[PDB]
Amino acid sequence: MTTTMKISIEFLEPFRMTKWQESTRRNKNNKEFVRGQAFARWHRNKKDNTKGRPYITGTLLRSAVIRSAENLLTLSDGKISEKTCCPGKFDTEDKDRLLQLRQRSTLRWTDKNPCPDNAETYCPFCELLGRSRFRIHFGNLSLPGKPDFDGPKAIGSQRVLNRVDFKSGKAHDFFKAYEVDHTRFPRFEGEITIDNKVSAEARKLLCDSLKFTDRLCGALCVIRFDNLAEKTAEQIISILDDNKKTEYTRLLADAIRSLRRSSKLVAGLPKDHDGKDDHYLWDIGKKKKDENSVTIRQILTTSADTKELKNAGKWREFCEKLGEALYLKSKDGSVLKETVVCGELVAKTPFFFGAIDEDAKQTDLQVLLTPDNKYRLPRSAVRGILRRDLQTYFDSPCNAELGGRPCMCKTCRIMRGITVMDARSEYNAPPEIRHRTRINPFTGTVAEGALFNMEVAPEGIVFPFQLRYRGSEDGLPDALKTVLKWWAEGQAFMSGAASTGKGRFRMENAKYETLDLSDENQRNDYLKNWGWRDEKGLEELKKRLNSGLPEPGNYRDPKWHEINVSIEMASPFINGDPIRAAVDKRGTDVVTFVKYKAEGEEAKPVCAYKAESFRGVIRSAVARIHMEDGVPLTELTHSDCECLLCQIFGSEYEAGKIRFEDLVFESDPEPVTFDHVAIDRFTGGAADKKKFDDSPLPGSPARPLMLKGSFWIRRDVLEDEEYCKALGKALADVNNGLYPLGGKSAIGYGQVKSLGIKGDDKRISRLMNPAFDETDVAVPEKPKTDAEVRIEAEKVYYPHYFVEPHKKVEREEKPCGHQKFHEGRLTGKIRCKLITKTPLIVPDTSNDDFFRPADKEARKEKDEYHKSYAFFRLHKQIMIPGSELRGMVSSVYETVTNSCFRIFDETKRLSWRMDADHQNVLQDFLPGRVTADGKHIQKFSETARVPFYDKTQKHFDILDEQEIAGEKPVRMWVKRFIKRLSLVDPAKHPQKKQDNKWKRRKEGIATFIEQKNGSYYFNVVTNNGCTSFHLWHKPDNFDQEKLEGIQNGEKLDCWVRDSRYQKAFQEIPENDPDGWECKEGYLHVVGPSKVEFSDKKGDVINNFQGTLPSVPNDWKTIRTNDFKNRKRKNEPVFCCEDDKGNYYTMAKYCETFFFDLKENEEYEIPEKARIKYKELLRVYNNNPQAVPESVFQSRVARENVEKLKSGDLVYFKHNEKYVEDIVPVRISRTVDDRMIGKRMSADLRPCHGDPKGLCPACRLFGTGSYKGRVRFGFASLENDPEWLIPGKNPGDPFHGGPVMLSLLERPRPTWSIPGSDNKFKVPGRKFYVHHHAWKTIKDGNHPTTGKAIEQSPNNRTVEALAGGNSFSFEIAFENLKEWELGLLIHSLQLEKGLAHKLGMAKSMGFGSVEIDVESVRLRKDWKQWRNGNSEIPNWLGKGFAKLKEWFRDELDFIENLKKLLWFPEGDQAPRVCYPMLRKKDDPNGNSGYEELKDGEFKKEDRQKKLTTPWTPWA
RNA sequence: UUGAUGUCACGGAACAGGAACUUGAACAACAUCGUUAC
């Protein structure tokens, strides 16, 4: 009696799902239950557990079909086939039921009786409505297989929705709702049961009503009927716990996260600046110990091929899930026609669609993606943007509140017939991240940890598009043909960070159509194939569409206006990006910003200049101009007031009216690399020995590096006359030269040359008119000097001459601040003109071996060679960087004003060497040994030396190898004294006995039992017959008159003397079995040390015999070859040489034997005495001057000992229960306790942060946490080069020939601080002196000797300029006080006799420049620039009346500075050169170093004969 | 896994704000080794 109907709906768009509720709050009063009534539901079996499946109710489908049929019945006047329907009844007297009512103004037709329930045949509409177990029953709809998922977060993910205001366009209350994806759950199934006694055509109405409905729950439907990442995540917490670097993790949470593009990106991580496989973050926490220590470049290479993380589908998720771990640690009518507008819209700029699901944070800003990582733009965004672009056509913001009778304004009648689809973008590449800091407007440096990220989607993504509007008006309404034309121009600002230039789509290749539904032949063809919503129907409809969008009727002037921007630079450029600096290949420290654009399926890079950076520059430029009742706009809070910044650029309570965009370079620029270094002040050399580089884009004055972009100002900001002025003013400054664009501007990066905008009918480009003063005054000349020295000939001088500072550094002024331009100070530019007078060198260290021979293979693998350089060129245009001209002027400006040492290495404690001859200090070392634990030393009593390496005895074999290392005590036979004879007491008084040594002789009986070959044996008693001995007298030419005849029993009166003799032997000497004890103690050898190797065949080696032997492979084998003193068999040697042509010599034929340990007398090793020994072992091994062999090397350097053990012997030094110094051998180097930083004063150490204050040369040039008020610039050559030595080939005067320099080895700070105790402070600042010694290098000689220099792999072959070249550069300053400008001009131009010095190899004669300050122009208001060249003689005179208030009359350091900058003017040849070591090895014979440590520069005349500048060394 | 005589949720832009900036001449001379003799 009943029939069935099996239907199934399919979705074409992600539908929406509501939340589960407890089954008592499903009432009418629950505010959240309604508002989710129209969404698909979620039913969980076993209540109190989130496990179930999604299901769609049936009453909802019923209401949708009722609405569709009610709509379809008014298109045909209320007739299905032949009979007519009744208006239907929708009344009820039970209002407490019916949880929700209808508020819709139901469509009308055929007003007549609604045929009340007292009838027996209703109108078919009342049959479908179900008026009187049911008549037509609607069954539920759920998934086909009825599966059972485990929660609402298993099928689709929740996200938040929005509701913005219109006037102040930010936002208000929000709401959230799930949304299941339609490509993983696209089908539902159910059933409708129909009685038989309903009708024969109500079924027809029902089928048509089904085919006419299209949306159920926020989607377009068509109803049809017939684990390495878990082990790695914490393994790299242990490698950070194995150190104390926890500030280096927020960046490692980001550098690895960016590897989610491809796997091959990890096989190219960078390496050290030298090239070894070491870094500062890819090799955190790895030492020599444990070679098997897995390193981060290895635990990532052991994740690239593991069969689970091979393909990118899981590789990307691997990095995403690994990076999220290292951050939680760092946290704590009957007219109706339907229009079909198809087409597509592409993205012209990177867009951003906000999607915060629940936590998702890790960046606190993410983009909206599909479940399989394709980009998508919702339909809620498109609809909310159409509403905004409609409320702008009209001038009426819709005031519809939430709830109630539907609104009826002009724009809510057009938003009631719109239907929009979604998009997928079919590109699925991962998004990139964009950092965005915030700069403190008081110090030019980033604020307190203000740094937050965001990720953006690429540009060039093609989305599909489709739209439909069905209504009464013929075709589209007037207010919708203009909006689509706005979007056709390219002004579709869809969503994202608008104020930074995000998404701007442009509708391409539009079409349209117009179907009519009020007829009866077209409508049936509309219902036949389900409109044209499906995939097949859309393609078939895509061949009936007439190209071209229609034309509007009332156009109304889009609300944004594009303004162009074009910028020319003249210098390099760099915009920082730190994370690319970590994962790159080259390994440079800081790199430039680069962005990718999606070509359509792949990504390619382009250099650019961010839009946030450009927004910030202009925003800060506008801020300093404005006064705003005294206090400027750079200190306000922007809370509830209308600023002039708070109105153009917006704030947190509204939105701005200007949208900047990225700027591109309109060429093909390629980065370069520039090395840098820090030149220490005292002992001028590379501090810390490490360099640091950066990669800018190469600008020039000939190739000016164009930039071109755009930005969009609103319409009603242009028309005003107050904001356009405030934008023209602050663009006229950006044009004049202030506000450099980019990074390291202090050394000349950025420095915009021009800026010209257009597209504003000269409404803004009206205050950018330049007007330059031209009062032509000549610059005053440099005053004549008075510092006179008296240089005579035939006397040689020295090249360093430190400058003793004063002792009062003034740090009592509060820094100014880079906010509003202060009024008492100056701001402008200086144009200089540098001219060299002695060949200059500035090397281009991009490549070595520039001076290469012809046809020679490049290199092989890893080898040393002759490094040949070239002059510094940028674009085949000889220049000089700004970092060179900054460190030259700053080091002279900070000594004129006597300020804090700006860079000075406060580490590297010093180490002198023991005094060889001095026995007063080399006596207090009391041999001992550290105890069983490394905490105490138990001394010894006395020592004696046991001979080895000789040809008398054997000790190498007959002793075992467990006691020649000093851990098994050994019995030995000592002899504290030896007994010397004499037999003629009165026959030696004149010929000897004049030396107070024969003061203990007692008696003697010349017994005799054996006569040797040349010896006379004697068994003589000493006192009375109780104590005798055996010994062998060495006869002389005064005894054979008393030993003229032997009788084997003679007796004669002789004499015995007891002499000092300290030796020890194994058992007993063969020659003398006299009184010898047998004591007990350890024994240690330090090996066969004390070698004196050379190449010149000294006196001892030339006193050999012939065929000198080779060097042995290992010791325990070395013996003695010859004697030093050959008359008496005294101190032996060992003379040998290898085949390389190198000669050795070897003393030390003995080793010391300890004995007589003393217990219950020990001392403690504190931690202070532990640093000195940890340090001393560093200096033995890393010795470039060490022996080329290793047999002759000492024990500590040979065995690479790195710390003191338990069972080892040392030579400690102590007092009162504490030890102070340890030393491995008898004579070896000491180390002071304090570091080198504590030898200066307390006010001369480098300036710290902020009280203490800031030294004066810290307030002009910057520091950390303060920005410098002076910028330099690249200097460029203007005449022709005029090389020093003619080039290899004539014709081209742009390449010079090479010259060969000398050694130039490192500077030693012990020749200046030779003492150690308390009175050896640090001298001044090491200024080199001016002279002419390059006339000798140019010929190829040596500055000290006269010999020629032969090339060796430690000297460079540079090309240099000559005397008589000119350069030009600029110096831009701001906020300088009046007197600081005086001393800066003083430090630039010196008096007429003086000269600066820059370059390389200036210890010889190389590099002498002098500067002449030309035109100086100031700046007073944004209009005029006041060429104030005629006021210098007041600044020069007011900067010298300040140096007289600080240091009243004690300016004697300035007259010592002025004697080092003195130039040898004419007919003077001051000969300066470094002394050699010995006098015997230089042909001139000028008293080398060994004769200088006694005599003139002994040890108390070195901090006095190195401070007075021009001291004649001779 | 609802209910029937009544659901404008295609009835609601996760929007608004923030300069990866500051500091640094690619430069450079005095030694290294341990004891030997009485």
mmCIF file of N, CA and C in Angstrom, chain A residues 721-787:
data_model
loop_
_atom_site.group_PDB
_atom_site.id
_atom_site.type_symbol
_atom_site.label_atom_id
_atom_site.label_comp_id
_atom_site.label_asym_id
_atom_site.label_seq_id
_atom_site.Cartn_x
_atom_site.Cartn_y
_atom_site.Cartn_z
ATOM 1 N N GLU A 721 43.394 68.669 0.858
ATOM 2 C CA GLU A 721 44.556 69.530 0.685
ATOM 3 C C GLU A 721 45.436 69.584 1.921
ATOM 4 N N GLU A 722 45.177 68.741 2.911
ATOM 5 C CA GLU A 722 46.014 68.648 4.097
ATOM 6 C C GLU A 722 46.879 67.404 4.116
ATOM 7 N N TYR A 723 46.380 66.289 3.587
ATOM 8 C CA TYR A 723 47.167 65.068 3.552
ATOM 9 C C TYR A 723 48.131 65.027 2.382
ATOM 10 N N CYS A 724 47.731 65.514 1.212
ATOM 11 C CA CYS A 724 48.648 65.541 0.084
ATOM 12 C C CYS A 724 49.879 66.383 0.364
ATOM 13 N N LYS A 725 49.727 67.481 1.099
ATOM 14 C CA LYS A 725 50.884 68.256 1.521
ATOM 15 C C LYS A 725 51.795 67.457 2.437
ATOM 16 N N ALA A 726 51.221 66.726 3.391
ATOM 17 C CA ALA A 726 52.025 65.967 4.337
ATOM 18 C C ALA A 726 52.668 64.749 3.699
ATOM 19 N N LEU A 727 52.173 64.303 2.550
ATOM 20 C CA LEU A 727 52.871 63.257 1.817
ATOM 21 C C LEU A 727 53.937 63.813 0.888
ATOM 22 N N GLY A 728 53.668 64.936 0.223
ATOM 23 C CA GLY A 728 54.694 65.569 -0.578
ATOM 24 C C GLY A 728 55.896 66.024 0.209
ATOM 25 N N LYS A 729 55.682 66.588 1.398
ATOM 26 C CA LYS A 729 56.808 66.977 2.236
ATOM 27 C C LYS A 729 57.725 65.798 2.519
ATOM 28 N N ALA A 730 57.176 64.699 3.017
ATOM 29 C CA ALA A 730 57.986 63.565 3.423
ATOM 30 C C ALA A 730 58.491 62.731 2.258
ATOM 31 N N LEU A 731 57.944 62.896 1.059
ATOM 32 C CA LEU A 731 58.605 62.327 -0.104
ATOM 33 C C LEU A 731 59.710 63.224 -0.641
ATOM 34 N N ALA A 732 59.624 64.536 -0.418
ATOM 35 C CA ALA A 732 60.700 65.438 -0.795
ATOM 36 C C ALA A 732 61.955 65.235 0.032
ATOM 37 N N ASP A 733 61.825 64.751 1.266
ATOM 38 C CA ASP A 733 62.998 64.373 2.038
ATOM 39 C C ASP A 733 63.603 63.077 1.533
ATOM 40 N N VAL A 734 62.788 62.037 1.372
ATOM 41 C CA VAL A 734 63.267 60.791 0.787
ATOM 42 C C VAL A 734 63.955 61.061 -0.543
ATOM 43 N N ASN A 735 63.542 62.115 -1.246
ATOM 44 C CA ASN A 735 64.173 62.429 -2.521
ATOM 45 C C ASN A 735 65.509 63.138 -2.341
ATOM 46 N N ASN A 736 65.649 63.947 -1.293
ATOM 47 C CA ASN A 736 66.825 64.794 -1.141
ATOM 48 C C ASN A 736 68.067 64.027 -0.728
ATOM 49 N N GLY A 737 67.923 62.824 -0.190
ATOM 50 C CA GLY A 737 69.049 62.010 0.216
ATOM 51 C C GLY A 737 68.920 61.404 1.592
ATOM 52 N N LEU A 738 68.120 61.991 2.474
ATOM 53 C CA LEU A 738 67.874 61.376 3.764
ATOM 54 C C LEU A 738 67.161 60.041 3.577
ATOM 55 N N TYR A 739 67.013 59.309 4.674
ATOM 56 C CA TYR A 739 66.296 58.041 4.658
ATOM 57 C C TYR A 739 66.824 57.099 3.583
ATOM 58 N N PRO A 740 67.988 56.490 3.781
ATOM 59 C CA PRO A 740 68.458 55.484 2.827
ATOM 60 C C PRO A 740 67.576 54.249 2.890
ATOM 61 N N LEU A 741 67.358 53.631 1.736
ATOM 62 C CA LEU A 741 66.500 52.458 1.641
ATOM 63 C C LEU A 741 67.350 51.204 1.744
ATOM 64 N N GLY A 742 67.202 50.467 2.828
ATOM 65 C CA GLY A 742 67.855 49.185 2.934
ATOM 66 C C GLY A 742 68.597 49.061 4.245
ATOM 67 N N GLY A 743 69.703 48.331 4.189
ATOM 68 C CA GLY A 743 70.347 47.861 5.393
ATOM 69 C C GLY A 743 71.519 48.681 5.873
ATOM 70 N N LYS A 744 72.733 48.195 5.627
ATOM 71 C CA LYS A 744 73.933 48.757 6.239
ATOM 72 C C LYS A 744 74.214 50.113 5.608
ATOM 73 N N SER A 745 73.439 51.107 6.023
ATOM 74 C CA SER A 745 73.560 52.434 5.445
ATOM 75 C C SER A 745 74.750 53.203 5.981
ATOM 76 N N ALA A 746 75.272 52.832 7.146
ATOM 77 C CA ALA A 746 76.397 53.552 7.723
ATOM 78 C C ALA A 746 77.652 53.454 6.877
ATOM 79 N N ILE A 747 77.767 52.441 6.035
ATOM 80 C CA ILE A 747 78.923 52.283 5.179
ATOM 81 C C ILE A 747 78.575 52.538 3.713
ATOM 82 N N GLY A 748 77.455 53.199 3.451
ATOM 83 C CA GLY A 748 77.132 53.658 2.119
ATOM 84 C C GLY A 748 76.198 52.795 1.307
ATOM 85 N N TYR A 749 75.298 52.050 1.939
ATOM 86 C CA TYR A 749 74.307 51.273 1.213
ATOM 87 C C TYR A 749 72.979 52.019 1.175
ATOM 88 N N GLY A 750 72.296 51.926 0.044
ATOM 89 C CA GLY A 750 71.117 52.737 -0.167
ATOM 90 C C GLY A 750 71.469 54.069 -0.791
ATOM 91 N N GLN A 751 71.234 55.161 -0.070
ATOM 92 C CA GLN A 751 71.555 56.509 -0.536
ATOM 93 C C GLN A 751 70.844 56.806 -1.857
ATOM 94 N N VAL A 752 69.515 56.853 -1.757
ATOM 95 C CA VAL A 752 68.667 57.073 -2.923
ATOM 96 C C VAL A 752 69.082 58.358 -3.622
ATOM 97 N N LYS A 753 69.142 58.311 -4.954
ATOM 98 C CA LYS A 753 69.562 59.470 -5.731
ATOM 99 C C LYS A 753 68.371 60.311 -6.173
ATOM 100 N N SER A 754 67.270 59.667 -6.562
ATOM 101 C CA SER A 754 66.084 60.385 -7.005
ATOM 102 C C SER A 754 64.853 59.529 -6.757
ATOM 103 N N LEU A 755 63.691 60.178 -6.770
ATOM 104 C CA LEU A 755 62.412 59.505 -6.554
ATOM 105 C C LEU A 755 61.317 60.326 -7.211
ATOM 106 N N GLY A 756 60.687 59.777 -8.243
ATOM 107 C CA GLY A 756 59.671 60.523 -8.960
ATOM 108 C C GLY A 756 58.367 59.780 -9.156
ATOM 109 N N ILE A 757 57.281 60.326 -8.627
ATOM 110 C CA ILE A 757 55.979 59.686 -8.693
ATOM 111 C C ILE A 757 55.112 60.404 -9.715
ATOM 112 N N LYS A 758 54.103 59.693 -10.207
ATOM 113 C CA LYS A 758 53.184 60.247 -11.188
ATOM 114 C C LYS A 758 51.873 59.483 -11.124
ATOM 115 N N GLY A 759 50.843 60.066 -11.724
ATOM 116 C CA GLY A 759 49.508 59.523 -11.615
ATOM 117 C C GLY A 759 48.625 60.261 -10.642
ATOM 118 N N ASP A 760 48.931 61.524 -10.354
ATOM 119 C CA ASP A 760 48.188 62.281 -9.355
ATOM 120 C C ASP A 760 47.933 63.721 -9.782
ATOM 121 N N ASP A 761 47.830 63.977 -11.091
ATOM 122 C CA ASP A 761 47.685 65.288 -11.730
ATOM 123 C C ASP A 761 48.416 66.390 -10.971
ATOM 124 N N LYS A 762 49.653 66.108 -10.561
ATOM 125 C CA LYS A 762 50.481 67.043 -9.801
ATOM 126 C C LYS A 762 49.749 67.579 -8.571
ATOM 127 N N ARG A 763 49.043 66.689 -7.878
ATOM 128 C CA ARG A 763 48.466 67.037 -6.587
ATOM 129 C C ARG A 763 49.415 66.772 -5.434
ATOM 130 N N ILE A 764 50.312 65.804 -5.583
ATOM 131 C CA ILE A 764 51.328 65.502 -4.584
ATOM 132 C C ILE A 764 52.707 65.933 -5.054
ATOM 133 N N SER A 765 53.027 65.687 -6.325
ATOM 134 C CA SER A 765 54.323 66.066 -6.887
ATOM 135 C C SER A 765 54.357 67.571 -7.160
ATOM 136 N N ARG A 766 54.019 68.322 -6.118
ATOM 137 C CA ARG A 766 53.955 69.769 -6.168
ATOM 138 C C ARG A 766 54.813 70.418 -5.105
ATOM 139 N N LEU A 767 55.151 69.698 -4.041
ATOM 140 C CA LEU A 767 56.095 70.157 -3.038
ATOM 141 C C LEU A 767 57.443 69.473 -3.187
ATOM 142 N N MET A 768 57.605 68.647 -4.215
ATOM 143 C CA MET A 768 58.876 68.020 -4.534
ATOM 144 C C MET A 768 59.696 68.845 -5.513
ATOM 145 N N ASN A 769 59.418 70.138 -5.622
ATOM 146 C CA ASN A 769 60.179 71.003 -6.516
ATOM 147 C C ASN A 769 61.486 71.408 -5.851
ATOM 148 N N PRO A 770 62.635 71.057 -6.419
ATOM 149 C CA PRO A 770 63.905 71.420 -5.787
ATOM 150 C C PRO A 770 64.195 72.904 -5.929
ATOM 151 N N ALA A 771 64.805 73.462 -4.882
ATOM 152 C CA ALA A 771 65.224 74.862 -4.891
ATOM 153 C C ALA A 771 66.504 74.944 -4.060
ATOM 154 N N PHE A 772 67.637 75.094 -4.739
ATOM 155 C CA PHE A 772 68.944 75.046 -4.105
ATOM 156 C C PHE A 772 69.573 76.432 -4.052
ATOM 157 N N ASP A 773 69.993 76.825 -2.853
ATOM 158 C CA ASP A 773 70.784 78.032 -2.688
ATOM 159 C C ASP A 773 72.090 77.892 -3.459
ATOM 160 N N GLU A 774 72.634 79.033 -3.885
ATOM 161 C CA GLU A 774 73.826 79.039 -4.720
ATOM 162 C C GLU A 774 74.821 80.114 -4.297
ATOM 163 N N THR A 775 74.793 80.547 -3.038
ATOM 164 C CA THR A 775 75.749 81.548 -2.586
ATOM 165 C C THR A 775 77.157 80.984 -2.678
ATOM 166 N N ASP A 776 77.934 81.466 -3.642
ATOM 167 C CA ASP A 776 79.237 80.878 -3.935
ATOM 168 C C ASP A 776 80.297 81.517 -3.050
ATOM 169 N N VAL A 777 80.700 80.797 -2.011
ATOM 170 C CA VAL A 777 81.829 81.167 -1.169
ATOM 171 C C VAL A 777 82.872 80.066 -1.285
ATOM 172 N N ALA A 778 84.141 80.453 -1.280
ATOM 173 C CA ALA A 778 85.215 79.476 -1.303
ATOM 174 C C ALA A 778 85.455 78.927 0.095
ATOM 175 N N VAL A 779 85.913 77.682 0.154
ATOM 176 C CA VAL A 779 86.164 77.017 1.428
ATOM 177 C C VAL A 779 87.493 77.511 1.991
ATOM 178 N N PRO A 780 87.576 77.817 3.282
ATOM 179 C CA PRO A 780 88.864 78.198 3.863
ATOM 180 C C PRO A 780 89.884 77.080 3.728
ATOM 181 N N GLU A 781 91.155 77.461 3.760
ATOM 182 C CA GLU A 781 92.218 76.487 3.593
ATOM 183 C C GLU A 781 92.628 75.899 4.940
ATOM 184 N N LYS A 782 93.380 74.812 4.877
ATOM 185 C CA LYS A 782 93.870 74.185 6.086
ATOM 186 C C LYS A 782 94.957 75.046 6.711
ATOM 187 N N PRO A 783 94.898 75.267 8.015
ATOM 188 C CA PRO A 783 95.924 76.070 8.680
ATOM 189 C C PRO A 783 97.274 75.369 8.646
ATOM 190 N N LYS A 784 98.322 76.166 8.800
ATOM 191 C CA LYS A 784 99.682 75.653 8.777
ATOM 192 C C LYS A 784 100.039 75.064 10.132
ATOM 193 N N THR A 785 100.742 73.936 10.107
ATOM 194 C CA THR A 785 101.014 73.186 11.320
ATOM 195 C C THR A 785 102.191 73.784 12.084
ATOM 196 N N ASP A 786 102.464 73.195 13.247
ATOM 197 C CA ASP A 786 103.598 73.599 14.062
ATOM 198 C C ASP A 786 104.365 72.426 14.651
ATOM 199 N N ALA A 787 103.936 71.191 14.414
ATOM 200 C CA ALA A 787 104.609 70.021 14.968
ATOM 201 C C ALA A 787 105.853 69.752 14.140
#
